Curated annotation (Swiss-Prot), chains A, B, D:
InterPro entries: Cypo_polyhedrin_Cypovirus1. Keywords: Glycoprotein, Host cytoplasm, Late protein, Signal, Viral occlusion body. Major component of the virus occlusion bodies, which are large proteinaceous structures (polyhedra), that protect the virus from the outside environment for extended periods until they are ingested by insect larvae. It is found in: Host cytoplasm. The keyword Signal applies. Residues 1-26 form the signal peptide. Glycans are attached at N27, N76, N85, N233. It comes from Bombyx mori cytoplasmic polyhedrosis virus. The sequence of strain H is shown. This is Polyhedrin. Its main location: host cell.
Amino acid sequence: ADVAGTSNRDFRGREQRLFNSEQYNYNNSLNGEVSVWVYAYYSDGSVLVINKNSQYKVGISETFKALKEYREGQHNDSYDEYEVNQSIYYPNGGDARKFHSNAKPRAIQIIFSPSVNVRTIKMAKGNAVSVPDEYLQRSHPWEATGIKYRKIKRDGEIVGYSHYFELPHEYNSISLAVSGVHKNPSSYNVHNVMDVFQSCDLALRFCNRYWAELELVNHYISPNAYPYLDINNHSYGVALSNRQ
Amino acid sequence: ADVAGTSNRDFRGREQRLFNSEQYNYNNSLNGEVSVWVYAYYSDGSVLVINKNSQYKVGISETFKALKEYREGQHNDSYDEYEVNQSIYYPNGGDARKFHSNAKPRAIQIIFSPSVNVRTIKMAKGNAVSVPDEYLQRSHPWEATGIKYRKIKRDGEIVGYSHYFELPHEYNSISLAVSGVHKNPSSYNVHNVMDVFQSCDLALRFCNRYWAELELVNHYISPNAYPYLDINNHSYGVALSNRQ
Amino acid sequence: ETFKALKEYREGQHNDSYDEYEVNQSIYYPNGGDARKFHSNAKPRAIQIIFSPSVNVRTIK
Amino acid sequence: ADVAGTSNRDFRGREQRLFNSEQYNYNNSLNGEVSVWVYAYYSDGSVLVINKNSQYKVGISETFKALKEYREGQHNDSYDEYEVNQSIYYPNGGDARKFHSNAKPRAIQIIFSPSVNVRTIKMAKGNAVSVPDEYLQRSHPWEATGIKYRKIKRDGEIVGYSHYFELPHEYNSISLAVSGVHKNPSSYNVHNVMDVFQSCDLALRFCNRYWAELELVNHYISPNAYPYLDINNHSYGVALSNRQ
Ligand SMILES: [Cl-]
Ligand SMILES: [Cl-]
Ligand SMILES: [Cl-]
């Protein structure tokens, strides 16, 4: 046979490049996944991740309370935190023994897979009682925030999209939903509506609290080939198109 | 300038009336919210509220167990209440140390925003094992209960719609889903189906147990300009159309 | 005051006492403890020192 | 340039030797620290360290009770240990459920920095009620124990001073204070008295219970360049004077 890395008959090298290309492109086909992650960052350094992975479209919707830190199998000041919630829902509505709950998120990062169409992204960032914009009567139920998403890039390739917002002020108390649609550069969609209804049931969800962004990078992002952007603006992910 | 409240050049007064009219009408546009609330009333006077707010259509679906009272950070007779559930699911199925759980709802109020089309409202009031009508094989999956909804009215304007039913008997043990569609007096809808799928992800949810109907009125209904009907048949809400 | 003495202590409430001993070991020497958190919320975020107007500022140490 | 390690123009080597010499000498200047450590060794192998670091003079003073083992966040037989204290303060004074408390120190090591003047060291080793010598009326308030301190040595240099005494008998129940003065080979001291008063406030204290002498060596002594002498008579510390 020819010697490796010297001719157009390195079929191991061609197949390696095809295998990676086929992953990148399959994910972009309508048979592929589109995925979203919400990361909620807490003052103790831990991070709640919620991920949804589904065909055609995907999203996540959480209450104010659901986004608060919950430490499984440890103390959570449960009763005092019920009272903190009452005061967050309406000023002076509760009788808590603290000014600021450390279970409140300090920041949110939303990441989508590179199979999303950025122009389809919509976010409903509500107040603590799940109202998008002060009162329901004046609320558009979403804002299309695609323009704000940064490309997460590795080796020149877009591996995902990131929108990051801090919640550093006492009044930053939110409920949150986000949604994106998988790329569809075709004009195909009539005939497939029941399949999209089935995708609503088929969407897989994951949620977990990791103890540190390091741990998120090491045990969540990296093992799964997920895109990420860390606090130091470092991009993670795996470039696949036309690559060995 | 002209003197306030004496001429057609009171533009502060015209803009105030327009601002309120525009809220009422925006909520009725297809760009607006439609919202639903389920209130479950407990014997200790507390009230669980579940609210969903979304574009195009909205609903809530809860199990028998999910509607039972849960007091965050306090004792809930957790083990005995598992046994009460077994006896509610099948006669004599559990080994509880009580005849009637005080965590069972005594009543349900369903309220919709005035942007719902009443004729689209559907309810699945199931038995304790989540069957609409005795056995699945004979169950229509919903009843269209719009005719029973009362108008909640302030200053002559419909501010919401209410259906209220007590559960005062021992055998009143229910699961519950409800759904309504936003007003659509146009013939527009083709082209918008993926947007409605995104609205399923974008819908915001809120749930909380308030200690008293007084507290619900003061800290939930009123601060948010929500419609309500209290036990004394008093209507709450804010009239907006053509009003200062 | 010591490092430990300046950490938050909530009288009559839970203070993650055991985990906070382990956090202290890791603060004293990298990787010295086996805590279940990255950042203790009992650590001060800031210090203000105030003196009365009867101090001589040039003597402050 | 000249080649490393072959001429009097290795200025990197001269500066390295100066940097170390300047540390050794600065510590001996009156601008330097003098430091003391009390190690209390427990039967479970753990060791309480108390350290004080201050200018001009330094010391530590602890009660009998303060020197007993305290395991943070674990059980400490608190009530029984109050009763053990009553019996230690006066024979048969308490009603404990044990003959010997394992929280009692088995030994004490006192170490001073090499900037102390050994002839200034004073110790008040009291009985369990904090009396130096049986009764206050006959007590000199200290003994000058410098003659008993061994030099801790590395590479020929004194890196600290150690006095070690076991408390292996049931009646070895002590309170303890120790004090040393920083070297002052000059005749300077008038003018500086308020500065010494400020040094009483400025002295920094550290205390911690380590689980093993190994851990003390690895995570306390060594990382901080502190002198130590272990149970096997091994000296630890860093020689600095005229050394690279
Ligand atoms: Cl395709
Ligand atoms: Cl419209
Ligand atoms: Cl000097």
